[PDB]
């Protein structure tokens, strides 16, 4: 019956206290750690209502009649319902229509209409939005017309007079079928990215929980790495596997990249975690890029020195330079600052680090990496992100620091909330004391 005997009919996040329920979420392990940490749990019903209201408002503000979503991350934002998320990312079997009057319909996997029933804001569970060759072979086009006619009828009933339908991403068969029904297809991502960019109070609570769980998982990985690196057998993959397992054990969902590398494989950055046998007296740098508990992305980066010797002075300087970079850049953060002014006033990396610097100095984060992208001045494009920061935005602040042809790089990154009058760094994970020149 109850999954948590110490509680009544509901868990702390308001969901049912029922070991046999369909809905998943954080494990008892995660909840125990969070309670011991004194973290306030999100109320999921209020969270789901917040997102839905805000997304509906976004449609209305643009004078659109609706938004059609095939990206599982947008579907997750709109409904909080998951279904084979990773398979869904490259197999578009799922769709959500949200109309300007708030009416929301999901076309789900035929076999699994029950996966969104926990959210009453999802008014209908249908099927048949899977318009790709694996699922339908030479008969995609017939179903594309069935599906587009369904969307037409829903829009006639729930957004009469509107011809503009925003779509995040759709297969060409789907696009043509919708256009044949008389829709003008608008850019759906411009709707979803800007909506998702402002977190409500429950999303922020959810993120604090996910962040705590992610930092716990990383601490397990550090413990494992410092204990086993340089034993002649332990690989990058061995270390990284710890993060995978500890995330899953806390109700997390997946990891977006393979960004953990050791020794000379840290420079250039973006070499992937693999079989390399790790060594004593070497750098290990990683980036969590992690979809964690409550489906919230925790995106932080740390660089470790592991060995009996001291790190080289150039490693210490680089680490200190990287730290100075993100602390200076996050100090720019407060409501009302224009994104291009972040670009213009950002901390200046030394010349020898300019060539291999990161693809941005900041980016948004929520269910994954999100709008905005804050480019360095030499890559920034005029008229691309002319908007101010607002309370409720969350930005990761980045530093990649390495020389061309060098044998190491530093990667640091913290996750930062915009508050009413400034910012709050959510990330508490320590910086390697030897690399920081403190030890």
| Residue 370 engages a copy of itself in binding (rule: CB under 8 A) | yes
Q: How far apart are CA 34 and CA 235, in angstroms?
A: 31
Q: Is 289 in the site for Fe ion (CB under 5 A)?
A: yes
**One of 13, 26, 107, 416 touching a copy of itself (CB under 8 A):** 26
Q: Tell me if 299 contacts Fe ion by CB under 5 A.
A: yes
Assign 3-state DSSP to the chain and report helix, strand, coil percentages, each to 5: 40, 20, 45
Give the Cα separation of 105 and 116 in Å (integer): 10
Show the tokens assigned to 151.
Answer: 């969307």
Which stretches does DSSP call E strand in 28-135? 66-69, 95-99, 104-107, 124-126
Neighbours of 105 (CB within 10 A): 21
Among 40, 45, 54, 91, binds a copy of itself (CB under 8 A): 91
Q: b/e for 289-308, b at 16 or more Cβ within 10 A?
A: bbbbbbbbbbbbbbbbbbbe
147-176 residues near a copy of itself, rule: CB under 8 A? 167, 169-173, 175
Using CB under 8 A, pick the residue from 383, 405, 420, 421 that binds a copy of itself: 383
Q: Which H or E run includes 385?
A: none
Q: What track of x and - describes contact with Fe ion for positions 391 through 410 (by CB under 5 A)?
A: -----x--------------
Which residues ranging from 222 to 281 are in contact with a copy of itself (CB under 8 A)? 233, 235, 237-238, 240-242, 244-246, 248-251, 254-259, 263-265, 268-277
For Fe ion, the closer CB: 50 or 269: 269
Contact indicator for 360, 366 with CB cutoff of 8 Å: no
| Residue 42 in contact with a copy of itself, rule: CB under 8 A | no
Please tell me whether residue 370 binds Fe ion under the rule CB under 5 A: no
61 counts as binding a copy of itself under rule CB under 8 A = no
| Distance of closest approach, residue 437 Cβ to a copy of itself, in angstroms | 27
Q: At what angle do helices 44-61 and 188-196 cross, to 10 degrees?
A: 140
User: Alpha-carbon distance 432 to 264, whole Å?
Assistant: 18
Q: Residue 12's binding partner, choosing from a copy of itself, Fe ion, none, with beta-carbon cut-off 5 to 8 A by kind?
A: none
396, interface contact from Fe ion, a copy of itself, none, CB < 5-8 Å by kind: Fe ion
* Choice between 321 and 363, CB closer to Fe ion: 363
Burial 24-60 (b: 16+ CB within 10 A, else e): ebbbeebbebbeeeebebbbbbbbbbbbbebbbebbe
Interface of this chain with Fe ion, residues 202 to 221, rule: CB under 5 A: none
Cβ 145 to Fe ion shortest distance, Å: 28
Structure-token pair, residue 46: 């209020």
Min separation Cβ 127 and Fe ion, Å: 18
Interaction with a copy of itself in 181-200: which residues (CB under 8 A)?
A: 185, 187, 189-190, 193
Closer of 270 and 317 to Fe ion (Cβ): 270
Binding site for Fe ion (CB under 5 A): 287, 289, 299, 396
């Amino acid at each position: 019956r109850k999954i948590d005997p110490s509680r009544g009919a509901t868990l702390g996040d308001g969901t049912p206290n029922d070991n046999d329920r369909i809905e998943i979420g954080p494990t008892q392990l995660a909840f125990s750690e969070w309670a011991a940490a004194g973290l306030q749990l999100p109320n999921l019903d209020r969270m789901r209502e917040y997102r839905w209201k805000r997304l509906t408002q976004a449609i209305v503000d643009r004078g659109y009649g609706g938004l059609l979503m095939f990206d599982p991350l947008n579907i997750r934002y709109a409904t909080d319902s998951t279904n084979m998320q990773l398979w869904n990312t490259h197999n578009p079997f799922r769709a959500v229509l949200l109309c300007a009057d708030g009416y929301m319909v999901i076309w789900d996997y035929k076999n699994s209409p029950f996966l969104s029933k926990f959210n009453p804001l999802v008014r209908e569970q249908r099927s048949g939005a899977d318009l790709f060759y694996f699922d339908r072979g030479d008969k995609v086009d017939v179903q594309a017309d069935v599906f587009a006619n369904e969307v037409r009828v829903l829009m006639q009933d729930h957004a009469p007079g509107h011809t503009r339908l925003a779509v995040d991403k759709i297969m060409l068969h789907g696009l043509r079928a919708l256009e044949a029904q008389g829709f003008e297809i608008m850019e759906g991502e411009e709707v979803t990215e800007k909506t998702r960019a402002i977190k409500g109070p429950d999303e922020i609570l959810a993120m604090r929980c996910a962040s705590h769980a992610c930092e716990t998982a990383v601490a397990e990985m550090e413990k494992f790495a410092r204990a086993h690196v340089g034993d002649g057998k332990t690989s990058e993959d061995d270390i990284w596997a710890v993060l995978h397992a500890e995330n899953i054990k806390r109700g997390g969902e997946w990891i977006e990249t393979r960004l953990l590398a050791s020794g000379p494989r840290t420079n250039p950055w973006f070499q992937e975690c693999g079989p390399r046998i790790t060594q004593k007296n070497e750098i290990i740098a990683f980036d969590t890029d992690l979809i964690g508990s409550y489906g919230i992305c925790v995106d932080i980066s740390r660089t470790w020195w592991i060995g009996d010797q001291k790190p080289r002075p150039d490693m210490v300087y680089a680490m200190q330079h990287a730290h100075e970079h993100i602390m200076t850049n996050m100090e720019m953060l407060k409501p009302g600052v224009m994104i291009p002014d972040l670009t213009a006033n950002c901390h200046r990396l030394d010349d020898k680090f300019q060539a291999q610097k990161y693809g941005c100095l900041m980016h948004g984060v929520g269910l994954c990496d999100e709008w905005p992208l804050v480019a360095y001045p030499d890559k920034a494009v005029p008229g691309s992100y002319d908007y101010p920061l607002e309370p409720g935005m969350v930005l990761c602040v980045e530093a990649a620091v390495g020389e061309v042809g060098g044998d190491f790089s530093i990667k640091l990154e913290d996750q930062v909330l915009i508050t009413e009058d400034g910012y709050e760094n959510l990330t508490t994970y320590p910086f390697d004391a030897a690399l920081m020149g403190l030890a």
